[PDB]
């Protein structure tokens, strides 16, 4: 065959619903954890424990001037 | 080209509005060369109120000022806000166009919303040119989809590395370096970084380039994400930060020099972690650095970048690339020890190139020479590289004593 | 010639981006997997042919990165 | 694409439409530390090899590097994105 036989070949496709659900779930959890840690580190922060910024940082609660606009209104429409 | 008149068949139609049944063709020619003669005398006298009253529009008050000039009675009802509508009537052999006027109840003009009151003429002064070009005051002319969570994360992380404060930047870079799930946002970060390094050509901002290089250095330290599929975008961005010539806004005081050795260390890391024999990353990078260094006409900044990258690649690279062109130091010291021009910027860049060259060639001279090194400096170019090599041997002896 | 094609025997002289293919054929790599599993010397006649096959295959270029990488990587995790 | 990734750069810009050069010298056998690689006292239906980046391996990316710049007359405006599916770790 090597003398004159050629077939293209492709990469192994992962069409499994279990591992696709796991990949999408873990990527969503990791990006939302990274986003919330970045936003809690670069702003005012609260803490459930005394002087606890590295582990479980909370974004501090800011008051709105008009709170029904950020509560009741839909953001994806 | 020719004298253009209204058509003679347009006067048979007009003569039947009058009641004239049969009008011969010599009378219709007699009518249309007179009415198209009086149109051209009010077309050209309306243009004298369009030009003397500087308007370039020919409003309908220009024709009414010219009919007043030719003593003919005015045309009533052409100052209202209208346009050109026409309505085609097919018919059983009679083809024509008309207006199709409309009606309106009288109480819906008594109860229309009134327009806003006009303003009076006032004056305004502003500079148009100040001893030269125009100022940039506003009175002058000007010259697959990320989810909302990760869209917000992308927005906050990118706007934290633009330079409002340093602490949010450090937490954003410590987020990029140490999060597990930042894939699906790697192409956006690569596009952001490469386009931002490109935007340096419009605005020579050293600071934003240092911030983008610290963004790349933070992206490399992430254990979870693999930059193999996106390294073809980050390689020329760091290369642009190395071998471009104008990295500064004020060339003399801005330390473009550090964004040089920082990005050189970065590209040595990017071709240590990712160079494979299928990639040929390191050999291509060395070839670009080499043909930028050996080729003359290159500025001292880009030669500094080439020498910095080549010397951060390793010891054998400076053995087989830097050490053949050590005679080039003489061509450098042509423009350093010896003038006549001194107040140019070609001296600070030249002795920066000199200092980097002898700092990196001192351990290479310590590796491939005798231990004595009595007059190696004299044998070296300019006798300075040899003094640096003696200092390097002394430093190595001190390190051995510490060990 | 085999139905128009000249064989490489020693008696002869010489928006989503599309899913790419490896630069080796299935058979070009069947040769590889068989040659590498014969060259780890489970049987001596298998080795010796595989060594002669390496020594005189004309089309063994464009597979040579994968052979060099298999050698290099092997000695380092084999010492 | 003006509204795609790099929209921030596009908005900041304000664009709104839409013999020592012989090949051997550079071969890394003649330029590298393989002396360190020497270890003294160590103390098919689908191709096995992973596909490489055809653009890096083949394309002339060197043509996106700039010879001269701030003091030069060229211009740029919105450009597209492509999303290579050869790379794993990309959900779509």
UniProtKB/Swiss-Prot annotation, chain A:
- Family assignment? Belongs to the TAF8 family.
Spell out the subcellular localization from the entry: Nucleus; Cytoplasm
Concerning what turns on (or off) its expression, the entry says:
Induced with triglyceride accumulation.
Miscellaneous note of the record = 'Taube nuss' means 'empty nut' in German.
**Complex and partners:** Component of the TFIID basal transcription factor complex, composed of TATA-box-binding protein TBP, and a number of TBP-associated factors (TAFs), including TAF1, TAF2, TAF3, TAF4, TAF5, TAF6, TAF7, TAF8, TAF9, TAF10, TAF11, TAF12 and TAF13. Interacts with TBP, TAF1, TAF6, TAF10, TAF11 and TAF13. Component also of a small TAF complex (SMAT) containing TAF8, TAF10 and SUPT7L. Forms a heterodimer with TAF10. Interaction with TAF10 is mediated mainly via its histone fold domain while interaction with SUPT7L is via its C-terminal region.
> Which lineage is the organism of this entry classified under, starting from the top rank?
Eukaryota, Metazoa, Chordata, Craniata, Vertebrata
Q: Which disease is it linked to?
A: Neurodevelopmental disorder with severe motor impairment, absent language, cerebral hypomyelination, and brain atrophy: An autosomal recessive disorder with onset soon after birth or in early infancy. Affected individuals do not show developmental progress, are unable to sit or walk, do not acquire speech, have poor visual fixation, and show poor overall growth associated with feeding problems. Additional variable features include seizures, spasticity, and joint contractures. Brain imaging shows hypomyelination, thin corpus callosum, and cerebral and cerebellar atrophy.
Q: Which domain of life is it from?
A: Eukaryota
The written remark on domains in the entry is:
Ectopic expression of the histone fold domain acts as a dominant-negative mutant resulting in differentiation inhibition.
Protein name, entry field: Transcription initiation factor TFIID subunit 8
**What gene name is listed for this protein?**
TAF8
From Swiss-Prot, chain B:
Localization per Swiss-Prot or TrEMBL: Nucleus
Q: Which residues carry this modification: Phosphoserine?
A: 194
The Gene Ontology CC terms held by the record are: cytosol; MLL1 complex; nucleoplasm; nucleus; protein-containing complex; SAGA complex; SLIK (SAGA-like) complex; transcription factor TFIID complex
Q: Which residues carry this modification: Phosphotyrosine?
A: 183
Q: A GO term (biological process) for this protein?
A: positive regulation of DNA-templated transcription
Keywords carried by this UniProt record:
Apoptosis, Disease variant, Intellectual disability, Isopeptide bond, Methylation, Nucleus, Phosphoprotein, Transcription, Transcription regulation, Ubl conjugation
Give the molecular function GO annotations: aryl hydrocarbon receptor binding; DNA binding; protein heterodimerization activity; RNA polymerase II general transcription initiation factor activity; transcription coactivator activity
Q: How does it assemble?
A: Component of the TFIID basal transcription factor complex, composed of TATA-box-binding protein TBP, and a number of TBP-associated factors (TAFs), including TAF1, TAF2, TAF3, TAF4, TAF5, TAF6, TAF7, TAF8, TAF9, TAF10, TAF11, TAF12 and TAF13. Interacts directly with TBP, TAF1/TAFII250, TAF9/TAFII31 and TAF12/TAFII20. The TAF6/TAFII70-TAF9/TAFII31 heterodimer forms an octamer complex with the TAF4B/TFII105-TAF12/TFIID20 heterodimer.
What is the disorder linked to it? Alazami-Yuan syndrome: An autosomal recessive syndrome reminiscent of Cornelia de Lange syndrome and characterized by delayed psychomotor development with intellectual disability, hypotonia, microcephaly, short stature, poor speech, and dysmorphic features.
* Family as reported in the entry's similarity comment: Belongs to the TAF6 family.
- Please give the name of this protein: Transcription initiation factor TFIID subunit 6
- Origin organism of this chain? Homo sapiens
Its gene?
TAF6
Measured against the full-length protein, the chain present covers 9 to 473 of 677
UniProtKB/Swiss-Prot annotation, chain D:
Tell me what organism the protein belongs to.
Answer: Homo sapiens
The Swiss-Prot or TrEMBL record describes its family as follows: Belongs to the TAF1 family.
This molecule's function is given as: The TFIID basal transcription factor complex plays a major role in the initiation of RNA polymerase II (Pol II)-dependent transcription. TFIID recognizes and binds promoters with or without a TATA box via its subunit TBP, a TATA-box-binding protein, and promotes assembly of the pre-initiation complex (PIC). The TFIID complex consists of TBP and TBP-associated factors (TAFs), including TAF1, TAF2, TAF3, TAF4, TAF5, TAF6, TAF7, TAF8, TAF9, TAF10, TAF11, TAF12 and TAF13. TAF1 is the largest component and core scaffold of the TFIID complex, involved in nucleating complex assembly.
Mod. after translation:
Phosphorylated by casein kinase II in vitro.
Description of its domains: The Bromo domain mediates interaction with histones that have acetylated lysine residues at specific positions. The second domain also recognizes and binds histones that are butyrylated and crotonylated.
Q: Point out the signal peptide segment.
A: none
User: Subunit arrangement?
Assistant: Component of the TFIID basal transcription factor complex, composed of TATA-box-binding protein TBP, and a number of TBP-associated factors (TAFs), including TAF1, TAF2, TAF3, TAF4, TAF5, TAF6, TAF7, TAF8, TAF9, TAF10, TAF11, TAF12 and TAF13. Interacts with TAF7; the interaction is direct. TAF1, when part of the TFIID complex, interacts with C-terminus of TP53. (Microbial infection) Interacts with SV40 Large T antigen.
Q: Where in the cell is it found?
A: Nucleus
- Tell me what this protein is called: Transcription initiation factor TFIID subunit 1
